[PDB]
Every structure is written in structure tokens, then in C-alpha cells.
Ligand binder design. Structure first.
Ligand SMILES: [Mg+2]
Ligand SMILES: [Mg+2]
Ligand SMILES: [Mg+2]
Ligand SMILES: [Mg+2]
Ligand SMILES: [Mg+2]
Ligand SMILES: [Mg+2]
Ligand SMILES: [Mg+2]
Ligand SMILES: [Mg+2]
Ligand SMILES: [Mg+2]
Ligand SMILES: [Mg+2]
Ligand SMILES: [Mg+2]
Ligand SMILES: [Mg+2]
Ligand SMILES: [Mg+2]
Ligand SMILES: [Mg+2]
Lengths: 87, 133, 85, 288, 250, 97, 95
RNA sequence: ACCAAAGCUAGCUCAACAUACUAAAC
């Protein structure tokens, strides 16, 4: 007998059907398209401008960072106040 | 409202440094042996011994120590090709004056492995280095 | 054997097929979306992160709406979006 | 050499009909059948043990258990928030350099170490990078531009004696994951994020010149080097007169993760391209 | 014209490569056409029948999924109530009528659902098993190197008579380099035979090598197998799966 | 203990059919093929068992987690009851504790 | 002890032992003496020192705690300024 | 020697795919 064709992983980008309700959610999430671009990029067909955050996303990121990450000068001033208090 | 981007190939030589090698690089040739880390390559020709202790994939001597039951200490010499009984005889002749008696040994011939009863890893490593393996 | 489509999508499939498909698209899109109603009985927290008073670490907090029951007499009046807790 | 290959000539063909595992590799399972292994089948007489209803492990038959009578004390209290640093001995570093896993001609970083398989960083286990110890400081003869997160005075002195550069930088867990596994991050499709600043607990460590902190004042580095040299009794070499001074003095921006790359770039490895942002808000956010 | 093949990989200084004949599948009598050199770390390693047995058992078992399932006493249809009272009846006490004691009752332990007997031997163990299979096939005079796997005709009886003349045995496994690069002559000659099986290089396995009495390898297949098998002797542990981009690995 | 009185027809099994001749052909697909596809991909069977192995409790847990939303009513009830029984037996019953 | 969890099917660990015990990497378990904070005015300075001193556990209790803890608590931890880092290993144990 | 004994089939079980899911008769 002759062997069957070997199982080969396709290197072409694969996009699931967004209108089929049987497709999973992780295959429609934006991270799926981002990873498809990272894998192929050219043959993927993903707008490279979408990899960066949008305006509202940038604003929310800046708010989060300014609320949960103090500046180096402010942190040094807080540390100086604390060491002065201990002294 | 997609932001504009620039596509460049100039800074892609930095990405080559972030790719780990899938193989192990051969040790560089030094002007003096042994190296400061104590490493030493084998001799250029093969010795006339009827056995060959092949180096590990990291270019180290395959002499390890093993513990069993929390109190049984053994020393394992691996990667032996040839008359393993000659290597066993040489090991017993080398370890007899150190202990005053013939050391207990097991010879796995189908595996090419020697197993001495006790911790003699450093001494066996130095002995194999003197023998040029 | 197993069902090809999960049970949670059966109502969606019936809404997609049959006479439910011939309904107006604006009505259909108004019915599909399930917006979170305003908190009436539970009091939500403002920020998405909070510092634990015991752990002194930042943790992501979320708001879970408390189930409220609307008796059939509430559909004849205007209770303000509340009901029986 | 392998006389077994010559012995295999007289032996018949090796097939699936003559295959035996190693003697002792398979301990045969024993079933409750027969006169010996039947008749209560290794369970004993009545009680809870034969019927399979004995209490849990810590239970001692109603007596207050040992694992509950001991008072609570802080031993692992806040253990999931203690910063961990994988140790790297100068002995191991010299071993890697001598075996050729890492090259002293280039700036050595955590990415280079994990590529050379010198250290393994598990950032999900609260690991915060690599610390330098001095277990092999006596026989260290390598001149490298090392980049660690913590270092001991003895290790820094042993490196300066050979004429290297030690620097302690900070990496929040995300940047540590990215620095340890860059290719799995480049295959993710996300821009290179910024390097978060160290918290207030580590700021005095990274703004100190004795620790060679990456946020420390570069004007106090020669003074600290001279103090270390005069303390450990070795002459401080003229580092600026070295042929590899550029490689020895190359630095990373406190917001930078890799060498040469910049926060906000997308590495498309399929087309070998680097997409850089051009938006003003994007650039301000990525350079802040 | 003598066709000679040299080892394209570094051979250790203490070991010499093993030489083998290169036959041709075109003529009946032309059995000695060239000379090939095979790496000793691939075709002359130590014969490890235990590793052979391990890899064979793995190949047989790791794909198995037993679709055997019996109904316990909880899945049988009836038996929801006591058949008789606990006392007074004079007979034995019972609960459900679907107990494993009863006739139409459930099974006490039995097989439970689809069971997957799945496990993965270490990659170096599987590679060493392949090496040992090739080495024993060479050492037992059951490995034959051919060139280009060319055939004059598509007659399977031609291959039958050729194997009977060359005393290859009952079963022959011809390994080619690629699947689409297989000549239609040998394809049609092997599609009608049972004991003569044609497989590509990525389809070589310990189970098939032990099932077929004779192995046939072409020169490009030998080179490919040597290159694929010798890579694991001096490789690192995978930081991430080898399907991802590495420095020197595809 | 009454044994059959006639000999059964000898099953003529050919060990050289297609399946027996090509069995386990691509087991080394990753090793001999520049690893892209794990031998997991050759496993044919239920979805919750392709390249996975566990005891009965883990099997039931994984089945309910993966394909539980498509099972029938009686099948899902029997699966929940089996999960409960296996939980109680494995966490409260036994000898070695 | 939950030998097989219901969500993941894994083995769980009891939190009391991690709250009142400390495992060194060499296999030893460290604990506090019971009653070192109760009625200190009624006890002698020597007894109070005995209560304040740390203590080890024997083989049976150590194996019990190993059974009650998972493998996450038996790992090698490299903490910054760990007081027990010098005790994480064992030296000169001639068994 | 009675009572009796032996068949190999009816069919079931577990999965995969699947039109997309209250069969036919009304
Ligand atoms: Mg061991
Ligand atoms: Mg037993
Ligand atoms: Mg058993
Ligand atoms: Mg008995
Ligand atoms: Mg009895
Ligand atoms: Mg008794
Ligand atoms: Mg009793
Ligand atoms: Mg009894
Ligand atoms: Mg009591
Ligand atoms: Mg670690
Ligand atoms: Mg019932
Ligand atoms: Mg009832
Ligand atoms: Mg009952
Ligand atoms: Mg039944």
C-alpha cells in the first residue's frame, strides 16, 4: 500500500466565519487578529494601525497609569517625608 | 481613526540578538588550559584504552552522583563505549588505595554505565581528565 | 449523542429563523442588546481597582448586580426600575 | 567497539514477536484474588479501615490536632508579594563565558542569560530578575558588561577588578516576562510597552551609586568605584582607554526594555519589519 | 559510474562511519551500484531492545481511546424504590432492584466512559528508538540503500520477482524523501501490493520498521534521516516550542 | 459450564490489510518533520479526550466543562451524579488516606 | 484534605498549616511553641524563653504537613533578605 | 433414557461529522 498524505500545518492565515454562531469567541476577539498579523502580517490582511490603542483606550491607559503609578519625584518626596518622620 | 505608522528595516538587527539558539555552541579555543572555570577539552587523538567515555552534550564529563533511600550514595559514570569491564577494572585499581579495599561496583553493559558505591565524583572526574577523555 | 448547537443558542437560532427573521432590523437590534440597568438596590463602587485594607495590595474589583424580582403587578405601574429583593 | 552489533548477526530478526521490557521496570500489579490476597483483601477486620470511612489526615480521633493546636504566626504572610531574585554566581557566569554560551564581547542581559540557559526566570512565581552573588569571585577573570537587578559589593568589586560594568535595573513583572521570552511576545501582536518605575520600596536601592542603580546619578559612579577599589585593594583600570568602551558603556533607557528598540514599536517577524508609531499622542504616551 | 555518498555531518574522532552498499531498483542483477557512508551515531549506536520495546508500546497505546462504557447502578432504568420491606418478609434485604447483585442490575466497576490511554515519551527517547531501529535493521542485514527509487515498469510482479531474487524477504518498506516527489511507476506498483509498502520520510516509525522484514532507503532519505536524528544530540531544551522562530532552527 | 459442541469458524485475519500495514505511520511527524504538528493531532476520538489522560473524575469534569452545554437532559443529570459520587468517594473513602 | 478537587481535579492544600508552619527546603518544618502568649505573668523567665524559642517537627508530623500541603510550598524560594535562607539547606548530615 | 445442553443473530453502547432539532400518520 501507499501511505496517506502527511498531516501538514497550513501556513496561510485562517479567518473564521463571524456570522456563524458556532464559532468560538476567542477566534473573533481582537487579540486573534493581532496574533494573526504577528504571525503573517502581509498575507493576513490586518490594518497595522489597529495594533496601537485608539484615542479612548489611550486616555483610559493614561488615567490608569497616572492614578496607579506616581512619578519618581513624588515618590522620592514621599520617601523623604517618611524618613524624616522616622528620624 | 487609525494612526499612521512607519515601516523600517534598520533596527531589525537588534531582534537577531533576542533569538535564542536551538543548538549548543561549541566551546571557544583558549590560549591556556584549563580555563579559569576549570574546563578542559579532550585530547586531539584518542587514547589506546579499550573504552571511550564520551563527553556530555555540554562538553562535560559524564560523572554524576546519585542518592537513593536518603542514605545510599553512588557515583555514576555514563556514556561509555567499548570494553566496560576494562574501565571497571581500572576504576577498582584506582580506588583501591584510597579506601584500602576493592570498591563495590555495578556494570550495566546494555546501557554502558558504571556505578560505584560511594561519592567519588570529583576524583573520577580528575582521573578521566588525566586519562584524556 | 450530542447536540450540534448548544442549548444556550437555541433561542438565538429560533430568533434568526422563521417569522422572527422578517421582523424589522431596528427592533431586532434593540432586542438583541442587553444593557446593564442602573443599580437601584445595590450600591456600586466607583473605581475598578481597590487597595485591600488587610493585604495592602491593589486588586481588581467588579460589580455584581443583585437579583431583583418584578411581580406581575409591577408591569401595570411605574416602580422606578425596582421590585422585590 | 559495539560487539553487540556483531552478536546481532547470529541472532534472528528483531520483530514485534520478541520484545521484552527491562527486568524490574514493571512491578506486576496484584489483585485481591486467591487464598493469600483475598479474605478481607488487605483491609483488616471491622471498623472504619475495612469499610473505608476513616477520618481525614489531620484528625487524631477527637483530640485537638497538632496542625491546629500550634498558634498562628507570620511565616508565609505576604509571601506572594515578596520579590524573588534568582541567584547567579560569578563561577557560573565564568563557566558560561568559557563554554561559549554567552559572549563577553556584547552587553550581557537577562535575555542573553536565558538564551544561554544560565538562569531560568519564572515571573509568575514573583521572580523579579537575577541577583549577583560572589561564590566564584576568586577565580573570575572575565571582562563583561553585565546587567542584573541586584548585586553584592563583592561581586561588583570582582567585576570591576577585571574591568567590567555592573548595573542594577528594575523590571516590573510584565517587562520581565517580555525580556525573558521576547519571541513569544513578538508573536503576540502588541506594541512594546514602557518599563514601569520601581516602587518606593526599591527606589532608594536603584537611585544609589553604591548599588550601581540604573536611576542613580552617573556623576557619583567613579567615586563609588574608587571607594570599592581602595577598600578591596585592587587598582581601578582605565575603562575609557579600552577598545570596547562603547560596548562597556552602552546603556538602556529606564523606559526601554531591549537594546536598540523603543517603546511603541511592533516587530513584524514574518516580513522582518519594524512598525513605528507616528501619532503625536502615541509618541507622547510611549516616551512619557 | 560509481556513486559514492559521504557523511555531511561531523563524525566523532573516536568512531568511524559505517559503509553500506547502494543498490538500484531498475535491474534484477545490478545489486552493487555504489557505496554510502552512514553516521555511526545513527546506524551504529548501541542496540537498545528495551528502548525499542518502549517506543513500540508507546506507538501502539498512545493513540488508543477505549469506547467501552457500562451502566452503573445509578444509570439503569428502574430500581428507585425498595422491592420489599426491611423486616418480616423472611428474605434478604435489598435497596434498589438495579444493584450489581440483581439480574438486570448495574455493573459494579466495569468500564467507565471513553478512556484515553495517552502519554508522550520524551523526544530524545523517541529519537533514540528510531536510531536503534535503524541500527538493528542495518546490523541484521535487513537494510538496503537504493538510489532515486526508480522502476522500469509499474508491474507489481516485477517488484515481487526482484525481491525474491535479491532475497529481501516477505515484507518490504520503501521509504522515499517526499510524498509528491514519488515516481508514478513505484506508486502504481506499491498501490496494488500488501507486503510492499511505500512511505515518505516523515512516516518512518519503529512499529513499521519492526513489522516489515526489509527496509529500503534512498540516498536523500538517508541524508534527511541522519540530519534530523543527529540534531538532538547537541540541542538545548526548548525555551518555546520549536515551531516558533529560533536562531538557527527553522 | 456447558461448552459449545461444535468448532467455531476460524477467523481468517489478514495482518496485512491497509490499517495493519499503515498503523502508526506518522507517529514521528513532529520529530522527522521540523516540528509543526504534535502527535496530539493524530488522536481521533471525543473532543474532551484528544491528547489528554486522567482518572474517571477528571474525565467527567473535563467532559462537563467542554461539551456539557450540548449534552441531553438525562445524560447531563447522570454526569452530574457521577461527578458527585466520584467526588465523595475519592475525597472521603479509601484505606491509605 | 481534598485529594481531587471539583473544579480543576487537582489536589488542594490546607491553609492552617501554612498559617502556623514554615517549611525549609531541606524538608524540615518550623513552628512556634504552643502557649507563648498566654499568661506570661504566671511563668518563669526560663519557661518564657523556652516558649519564645522556635522548634522543629519530627518525621511523622513533617510527613503529615507534606501530605497536607501541595508542591507549591515545597519549591525553592529566593527571597530578598530572607532570614531563613541560611537554613534552607543542610550541611554535614552523615546518614 | 427422560429432564435437558450448544449455536449467531436480533439488536444495543460509546464517540465524529451533520443538516441545524417536537419522526410518519393525520
Ligand atoms: Mg537520582
Ligand atoms: Mg497491595
Ligand atoms: Mg489495582
Ligand atoms: Mg488474605
Ligand atoms: Mg472465603
Ligand atoms: Mg479479631
Ligand atoms: Mg474492631
Ligand atoms: Mg467480615
Ligand atoms: Mg473532647
Ligand atoms: Mg526558578
Ligand atoms: Mg435511581
Ligand atoms: Mg425514595
Ligand atoms: Mg439505600
Ligand atoms: Mg444491564
Amino acid at each position: 500500500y501507499r501511505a496517506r498524505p502527511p498531516p501538514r500545518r497550513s501556513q496561510e492565515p485562517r479567518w473564521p466565519d463571524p456570522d456563524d454562531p458556532l464559532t468560538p469567541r476567542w477566534q473573533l476577539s481582537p487579540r486573534y487578529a493581532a496574533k494573526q498579523f504577528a504571525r503573517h502580517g502581509a498575507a493576513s490582511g490586518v490594518a497595522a494601525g489597529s495594533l496601537w490603542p485608539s484615542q479612548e483606550q489611550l486616555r483610559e491607559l493614561e488615567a490608569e497609569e497616572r492614578e496607579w503609578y506616581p512619578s519618581l519625584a513624588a515618590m522620592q518626596e514621599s520617601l523623604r517625608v517618611q524618613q524624616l518622620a522616622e528620624e | 481613526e487609525y494612526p499612521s505608522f512607519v515601516e523600517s528595516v534598520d533596527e531589525y538587527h537588534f531582534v537577531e540578538r533576542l533569538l535564542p539558539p536551538a543548538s549548543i555552541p561549541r566551546p571557544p579555543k583558549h590560549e591556556h588550559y584549563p580555563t579559569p572555570s576549570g574546563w578542559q577539552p579532550p585530547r586531539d587523538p584518542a587514547p589506546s584504552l579499550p573504552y571511550f567515555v564520551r563527553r556530555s552534550r555540554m562538553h562535560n564529563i559524564p560523572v554524576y552522583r546519585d542518592i537513593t533511600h536518603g542514605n545510599r550514595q553512588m557515583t555514576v559514570i555514563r556514556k561509555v563505549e567499548g570494553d566496560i569491564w576494562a574501565l571497571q577494572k581500572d576504576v577498582e585499581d584506582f580506588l583501591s588505595p584510597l579506601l584500602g579495599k576493592t570498591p563495590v561496583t555495578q556494570v550495566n553493559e546494555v546501557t554502558g554505565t558504571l556505578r560505584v558505591k560511594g561519592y567519588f565524583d570529583q576524583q573520577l572526574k580528575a582521573w578521566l581528565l588525566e586519562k584524556g577523555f | 449523542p450530542l447536540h450540534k448547537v448548544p442549548v444556550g443558542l437555541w433561542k438565538q437560532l429560533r430568533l434568526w429563523e422563521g417569522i422572527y427573521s422578517r421582523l424589522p432590523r431596528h427592533y431586532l437590534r434593540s432586542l438583541e442588546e442587553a444593557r446593564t440597568p442602573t443599580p437601584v438596590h445595590y450600591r456600586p463602587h466607583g473605581a475598578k481597582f481597590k487597595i485591600n485594607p488587610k493585604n495592602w495590595q491593589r486588586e481588581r474589583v467588579e460589580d455584581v448586580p443583585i437579583p431583583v424580582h418584578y411581580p406581575p403587578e409591577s408591569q401595570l405601574g411605574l416602580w422606578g426600575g425596582e421590585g422585590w429583593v | 567497539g559495539p560487539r553487540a552489533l556483531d552478536l546481532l548477526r547470529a541472532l534472528p530478526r528483531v520483530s514485534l514477536a520478541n520484545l521484552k521490557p527491562n527486568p524490574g521496570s514493571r512491578k506486576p500489579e496484584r489483585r485481591p484474588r486467591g487464598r493469600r490476597r483475598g479474605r478481607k483483601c488487605g483491609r483488616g477486620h471491622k471498623g472504619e479501615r475495612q469499610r473505608g470511612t476513616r477520618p481525614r489526615l489531620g484528625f487524631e480521633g477527637g483530640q485537638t490536632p497538632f496542625y491546629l493546636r500550634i498558634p498562628k504566626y507570620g511565616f508565609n504572610e505576604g509571601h506572594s508579594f515578596r520579590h524573588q531574585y534568582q541567584p547567579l554566581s560569578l563561577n557560573r557566569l565564568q563557566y558560561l563565558i568559557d563554554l561559549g554560551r554567552v559572549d563577553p564581547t556584547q552587553p550581557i542581559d537577562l535575555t542573553q542569560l536565558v538564551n544561554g540557559r544560565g538562569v531560568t526566570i519564572q515571573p509568575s512565581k514573583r521572580d523579579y530578575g537575577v541577583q549577583l552573588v560572589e561564590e566564584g569571585a576568586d577565580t573570575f577573570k572575565a571582562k563583561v558588561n553585565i546587567e542584573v537587578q541586584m548585586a553584592s559589593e563583592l561581586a561588583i568589586a570582582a567585576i570591576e577588578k577585571n574591568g567590567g560594568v555592573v548595573t542594577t535595573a528594575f523590571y516590573d513583572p510584565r517587562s520581565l516576562e517580555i525580556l525573558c521570552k521576547p519571541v513569544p511576545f513578538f508573536l503576540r501582536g502588541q506594541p512594546i510597552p514602557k518599563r514601569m518605575l520601581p516602587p518606593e520600596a526599591l527606589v532608594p536601592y536603584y537611585t544609589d551609586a553604591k548599588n550601581r542603580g540604573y536611576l542613580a546619578d552617573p556623576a557619583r559612579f567613579p567615586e563609588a568605584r574608587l571607594e570599592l577599589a581602595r577598600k578591596y585593594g585592587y587598582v581601578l583600570p582605565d575603562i575609557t582607554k579600552d577598545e570596547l568602551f562603547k560596548m562597556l558603556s552602552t546603556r538602556k533607557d529606564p523606559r526601554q526594555i531591549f537594546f536598540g528598540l523603543a517603546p511603541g514599536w511592533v516587530v513584524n517577524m514574518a516580513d522582518k519589519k519594524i512598525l513605528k508609531p507616528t501619532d503625536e499622542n502615541l509618541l507622547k504616551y510611549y516616551s512619557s | 559510474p560509481p556513486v559514492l555518498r559521504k557523511c555531511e555531518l561531523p563524525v566523532p574522532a573516536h568512531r568511524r562511519p559505517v559503509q553500506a552498499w547502494i543498490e538500484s531498483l531498475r535491474g534484477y542483477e545490478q545489486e552493487r551500484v555504489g557505496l554510502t557512508e552512514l553516521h555511526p551515531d545513527v546506524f551504529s549506536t548501541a542496540p537498545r531492545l528495551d528502548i525499542l520495546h518502549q517506543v513500540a508500546i508507546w506507538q501502539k497505546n498512545f493513540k488508543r481511546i477505549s469506547y467501552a462504557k457500562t451502566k452503573t447502578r445509578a444509570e439503569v432504568r428502574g430500581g428507585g424504590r425498595k422491592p420489599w420491606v426491611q423486616k418480616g418478609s423472611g428474605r434478604a434485604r435489598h435497596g434498589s432492584i438495579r444493584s450489581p447483585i440483581w439480574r438486570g442490575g448495574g455493573v459494579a466497576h466495569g468500564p467507565r466512559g471513553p478512556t484515553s490511554y495517552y502519554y508522550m515519551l520524551p523526544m530524545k527517547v523517541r529519537v533514540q528508538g528510531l536510531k536503534v531501529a535503524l541500527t538493528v535493521k542495518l546490523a541484521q542485514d535487513d537494510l538496503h540503500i537504493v538510489d532515486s527509487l526508480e522502476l522500469p515498469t509499474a508491474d507489481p510482479q516485477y517488484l515481487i520477482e526482484l525481491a525474491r531474487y535479491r532475497r529481501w524477504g516477505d515484507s518490504v518498506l520503501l521509504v522515499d524523501l517526499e510524498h509528491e516527489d514519488m515516481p508514478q511507476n513505484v506508486v502504481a506498483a506499491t498501490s496494488g501490493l500488501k507486503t510492499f509498502n511505500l512511505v515518505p520520510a516523515v512516516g518512518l516509525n519503529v512499529h513499521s520498521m519492526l513489522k516489515h522484514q526489509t527496509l529500503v532507503l534512498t540516498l536523500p532519505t538517508v541524508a534527511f534521516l541522519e540530519e534530523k536524528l543527529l540534531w538532538h544530540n547537541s540541542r538545548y531544551t526548548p525555551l518555546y516550542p520549536f515551531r516558533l522562530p529560533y536562531c538557527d532552527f527553522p | 459450564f456447558h461448552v459449545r459442541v461444535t468448532l467455531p469458524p476460524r477467523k481468517v485475519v489478514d495482518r496485512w490489510n491497509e490499517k495493519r500495514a499503515m498503523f502508526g505511520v506518522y507517529d514521528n511527524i513532529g520529530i522527522l518533520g521540523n516540528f509543526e504538528k504534535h502527535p496530539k493531532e493524530l488522536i481521533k476520538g471525543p473532543i474532551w479526550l484528544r491528547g489528554w489522560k486522567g482518572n474517571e473524575l477528571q474525565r467527567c469534569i473535563r467532559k462537563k466543562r467542554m461539551v456539557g452545554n450540548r449534552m441531553f437532559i438525562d445524560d447531563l443529570h447522570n454526569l452530574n451524579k457521577r461527578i458527585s459520587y466520584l467526588y465523595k468517594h475519592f475525597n472521603r473513602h479509601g484505606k491509605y488516606r | 484534605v481534598t485529594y481531587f478537587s471539583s473544579r480543576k481535579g487537582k489536589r488542594k492544600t490546607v491553609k492552617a498549616v501554612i498559617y502556623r508552619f514554615l517549611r525549609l527546603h531541606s524538608g524540615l518544618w518550623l513552628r512556634r511553641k504552643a502557649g507563648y502568649k498566654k499568661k506570661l505573668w504566671k511563668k518563669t523567665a526560663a519557661r518564657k524563653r523556652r516558649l519564645r524559642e522556635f522548634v522543629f517537627c519530627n518525621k511523622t508530623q513533617s510527613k503529615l504537613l507534606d501530605k497536607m500541603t501541595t508542591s507549591f510550598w515545597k519549591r525553592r524560594n529566593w527571597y530578598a533578605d530572607d532570614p531563613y535562607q541560611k537554613y534552607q539547606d543542610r550541611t554535614n548530615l552523615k546518614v
